[PDB]
C-alpha cells in the first residue's frame, strides 16, 4: 500500500525523417505516508505506460524516512550538482512548508513541520534527485551512536 503520486509529464520529440516522434516521461514519486519513498521517471510512447513503469521504478528505487514527531533531525545543504535542496527543523503545527517536489516527496514521507528552501536550478528532474539524496543523506541520533561510538 504505497502511493503512485505522479509529479508531472514530459514530452520528448525526436525529429523523424518524415516527421517528429514524441515520447512520454512520467515523473513519479511513490510513498506510503508513514516513512518510505522511491523515485521514477517513465519512458514510453503513450501516457499510462510511462506512468506505470515509472511508478514501478519508484517502487524499486526505495529509501527509509527518520521522523521525530514529524520533522527533520537536523539541517542539510544537499546539492545534486545543478539543484540545491536545503532542509531545516520546525516545531509542530508549522505545516509542510515546502516547494513543489519538496513537499510532494516529503508528504509521501509525511513530514509535518519542515522549513525547506530550494536553490539553484529548479529543474524538476534534478530537484527530485537532489531531494531523494537529501533524505538519503539523513543522519539521526541512532546512526550517530553507531559510528560516534567507534568500532
Amino acid at each position: 500500500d504505497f502511493e503512485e503520486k505522479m509529479i508531472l509529464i514530459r514530452r520528448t520529440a525526436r525529429m523523424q525523417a518524415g516527421g517528429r516522434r514524441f515520447r512520454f516521461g512520467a515523473l513519479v514519486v511513490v510513498g506510503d505516508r508513514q516513512g518510505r519513498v522511491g523515485l521514477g521517471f517513465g519512458k514510453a510512447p503513450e501516457v499510462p505506460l510511462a506512468v506505470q513503469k515509472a511508478g514501478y521504478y519508484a517502487r524499486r528505487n526505495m529509501v527509509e524516512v527518520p521522523l521525530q514527531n514529524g520533522t527533520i533531525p537536523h539541517e542539510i545543504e544537499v546539492e545534486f550538482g545543478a539543484s540545491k535542496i536545503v532542509l531545516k527543523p520546525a516545531a509542530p503545527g508549522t505545516g509542510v512548508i515546502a516547494g513543489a517536489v519538496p513537499r510532494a516527496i516529503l508528504e509521501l514521507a509525511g513530514v509535518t513541520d519542515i522549513l525547506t528552501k530550494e536553490l539553484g536550478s529548479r529543474n524538476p528532474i534534478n530537484i527530485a534527485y537532489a531531494t531523494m539524496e537529501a533524505l538519503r543523506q539523513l543522519r539521526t541520533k541512532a546512526d550517530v551512536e553507531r559510528l560516534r561510538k567507534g568500532e
Partner: protein
C-alpha cells in the same frame, strides 16, 4: 610555505576521509594536538602521536570508518562527515556566550578556542567562556 597548517591539516584529514586510507600525517604543533585531542575525544579520529619524518617532527593521525554495506557498490560510509574552517585569516570570528552555533542543530560539534584553551560548542557554552571559532565538524 603555508598560511594555515591548521586548515591544511583539516584538508589532509578531508583527504584521508574522502579516500579511505586509515591514517595520514601532519607536522609538529601544539594546537593541532589540541584539536585532534578534541577529535578523538568525541569519537571521531582514531588517534594521534608526535612522530617524525626525515628528521622533522610530525603529528600522524589515524581515523575512523563505518561498516561495509552491499548493493550500491561496497563503499562503507564515513564517520568524519565534514569539517569546515570557519575563522579564516580574513574572517577572524570571535564568538562569545549567547553567540555560538548549534551545528546540525543538536549533534555535530563546534571547535572554538577561548580564554582558557580549546573548547567545544556544548563545552564552551557550559563553561561560559568564548573566543575564536575554529572549524565545524559533523
Amino acid at each position: 610555505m603555508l598560511t594555515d597548517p591548521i586548515a591544511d591539516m583539516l584538508t589532509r584529514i578531508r583527504n584521508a576521509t574522502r579516500v579511505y586510507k586509515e591514517s595520514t600525517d601532519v607536522p609538529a604543533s601544539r594546537f593541532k594536538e589540541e584539536i585532534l585531542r578534541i577529535l578523538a575525544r568525541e569519537g571521531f579520529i582514531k588517534g594521534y602521536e608526535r612522530v617524525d619524518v626525515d628528521g622533522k617532527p610530525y603529528l600522524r593521525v589515524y581515523l575512523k570508518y563505518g561498516p561495509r554495506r552491499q548493493g550500491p557498490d561496497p563503499r562503507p560510509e564515513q564517520v568524519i562527515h565534514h569539517i569546515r574552517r570557519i575563522s579564516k585569516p580574513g574572517r577572524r570570528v570571535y564568538v562569545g556566550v549567547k553567540e555560538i552555533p548549534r551545528v546540525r542543530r543538536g549533534l555535530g560539534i563546534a571547535i572554538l578556542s577561548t580564554s582558557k584553551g580549546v573548547l567545544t560548542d556544548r563545552e564552551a557554552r557550559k563553561l561560559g567562556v568564548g573566543g575564536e571559532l575554529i572549524c565545524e565538524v559533523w
